[PDB]
């Protein structure tokens, strides 16, 4: 069955934006379609890279299934629950995208993350992650003790290195900071590699797709 999004965009739903809660009883799908203008695109302001290419791909698939690749409790080195924002509310309190994890410092430290996930499935995996661009130097230190940070994402077909741009931006949904999100398709035997000392928005859930 085709997934028709009533109030939400593709980006918002894949990331699991709290503002798009629509009743879904059956968790298997064929493809994803976006009609007209979505009420909620991104609750935390920012950008979604290669969005047009991704929407075409997800309308080009005949099977769509969500799965948990990296459990949020598997981060014992950092804080995976406290990173939240008022721009993404849930039940009146601060929250975040459900399918992606905002990692912040545990105590006074943010150790360097080296984590690898190998696709062990028989299907292509849609994997999403992000980078957070903090408001100023003060906010950077608040969230992650390390002033100078990076995000490395490797795959056999991709080499990415991100450096957060610390700048004050226009207030959208109450926030002067931004978040940039990225995606790739992980081949059934290929593995994705992450390295970060800060500003990393880590994947929890991914999506098995069939062409």
């Amino acid at each position, epitope marked *: 069955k085709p997934l028709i999004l009533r109030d939400c965009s593709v980006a918002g739903w894949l990331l699991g934006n709290p503002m798009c809660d629509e009743f879904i009883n059956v968790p298997e799908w064929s493809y994803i379609v976006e009609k007209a203008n979505p009420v909620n695109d991104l609750c935390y302001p920012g950008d979604f890279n290669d969005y047009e290419e991704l929407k075409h791909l997800l309308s080009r698939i005949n099977h769509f299934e969500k799965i948990q690749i990296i459990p949020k409790s598997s981060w014992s080195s950092h804080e995976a629950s*406290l990173g*939240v924002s008022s721009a993404c509310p849930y039940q*009146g309190k601060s929250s975040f995208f459900r399918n992606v994890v905002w990692l912040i410092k545990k105590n006074s430290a943010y150790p360097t993350i080296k984590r690898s996930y190998n696709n062990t499935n028989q299907e292509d995996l849609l994997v999403l992650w992000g980078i957070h661009h903090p408001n100023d130097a003060a906010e950077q230190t608040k969230l992650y003790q390390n002033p100078t940070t990076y995000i490395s994402v490797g795959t056999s077909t991709l080499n990415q290195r991100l450096v957060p741009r610390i700048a004050t931006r226009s207030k959208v949904n109450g926030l002067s900071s931004r978040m940039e999100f990225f995606w790739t398709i992980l081949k059934p035997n290929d593995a994705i590699n992450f390295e970060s000392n800060g500003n990393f928005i880590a994947p929890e859930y991914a999506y098995k797709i069939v062409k």
Partner: antibody
Amino acid sequence: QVQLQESGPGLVKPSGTVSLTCAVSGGSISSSYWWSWVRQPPGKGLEWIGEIYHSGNTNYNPSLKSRVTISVDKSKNLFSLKLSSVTAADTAVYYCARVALFDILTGGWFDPWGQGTLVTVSS
Amino acid sequence: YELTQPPSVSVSPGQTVNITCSGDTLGDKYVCWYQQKPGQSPVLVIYQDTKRPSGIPERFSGSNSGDTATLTVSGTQAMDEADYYCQAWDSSSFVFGTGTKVTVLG
């Protein structure tokens, strides 16, 4: 400006229920704000009691959690406090306050505050 | 969870006074500060560690690192004599500091 006003009986007998309400003017109870109760026994520090959101969600001080109830009346545009099974340790000045969320992370700040009302527990 | 403040501090008029607030992993939490005159309601001076509400003089400033937060008043006047409480949030509970009395020596 938004203003908060506490009212209720200033004298409650031991084992009785402290019953207070907070009138909100200048703003609506249905907001992104939370509505909190805070008490201060005479000559002592501030103590958080609990809070409530217009949807009905509540959060209470775990040490008072057994005997405390906070509710909200959207029509009369007010929220209220019921603290049961009181003792002399419950004699305090009771404040109500509006709580705002941080743009990032957990918690929030209290503003504005009501004038506060003294509640004495004595038989 | 508890927030510890010094019971009292005194400061000469025109000098600078630091009000400290201590707690476990307090640097991971945003801290707020409240001014209270006797027989009156608390007044927000500093929220989200460094921010001043409109109507609060630039005299007031705050900072937070490690396990300790600090409220700072520079060139303090007579009207700045009051009680000061730090505040934070932990595990679905709001927490207030024990309070600090600031006396400007007259």
